[model samples]
Target: MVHLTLKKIQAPKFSIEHDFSPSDTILQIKQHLISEEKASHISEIKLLLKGKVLHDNLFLSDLKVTPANSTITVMIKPNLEHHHHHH
Candidate 1:
């Protein structure tokens, strides 16, 4: 099992740590965040490792992260889009 420390870029103080098997995919973590109410939707969730975006189908074993513990940066898109009005 590998320990993943997820930190949200939008919410600097927000963080989640979980253990996962090598077989687990990046999507699993997104699902977990949604289930835990930490995130709203999978489409809005973006995870980055070492500044590189992680794909949903990518398995943990594919990363081969070292030190047993790894930190992933989480980014969530806002539910609403910004609209500009002419004054």
Candidate 2:
């Protein structure tokens, strides 16, 4: 089991530390956060590690997030919008 802290990038922080498996995917983490926030959406959630955005298909271990490393300062953000310019 690994304990990690997840923090939102916005003010009035909604952060916490919890135990997780290294095999867990980014989507799993997002789901946990959304459950905590209750007002969050799956597609709206984004997680960043070491200044890089994490993909849903990747496991924590794939990003080198291990129990030995302990704390991982993840920047959580909501309401991410994507757009395509006119062709």
Candidate 3:
């Protein structure tokens, strides 16, 4: 089984590990996040592999990595969008 390390952007010191696979979708990770009870809104939670932000439909294997790095670094954060107010 593949293991992924989830790192909070602002709080790298704190993180968690979960059994995951490269074939898993980004949404699946979000679901895991939901199961952890960290994110209340799955849609608002953002996932990233390395420094690249992840897409909902993207597979975990899309990112190029080597066998030397067995564990993948996943960044977690809230994706907040700002909307302009009509005057």
Best by lDDT: 1
Weakest 10 consecutive residues of candidate 3 by summed lDDT: 78-87
Best of the two (1, 2) by TM-score = 1
- Candidate 2, poorest ten consecutive residues by summed lDDT: 78-87
lDDT of candidate 3 over 1-87, digit per residue (tens): 445666555422356665666787768877877787655455655656555666766776774333444344444453334344333
TM-score (C-alpha) between model 2 and the true structure? 0.62
Residue 40, model 3, lDDT: 43
Models 1 onward score TM values of 0.76, 0.62, 0.59
Per-residue C-alpha lDDT of model 1 across residues 1-87, encoded as one tens digit per residue: 466788876842487777788888888878888888777787678888888888866788987555443887878654443354333
Off by over 4 Å in 2: 67-87
Residue 8 CA error for candidate 2 (Å)? 1.2
Candidate 1 Cα misplacement greater than 4 A, ranges: 11-13, 78-87
After TM-score superposition, what is the CA distance of residue 43 in candidate 3 from its true location, in Å?
3.3
lDDT tens string, model 2, 16-36? Answer: 666768787778877877787
Alpha carbon lDDT of each predicted model: 0.74, 0.62, 0.58
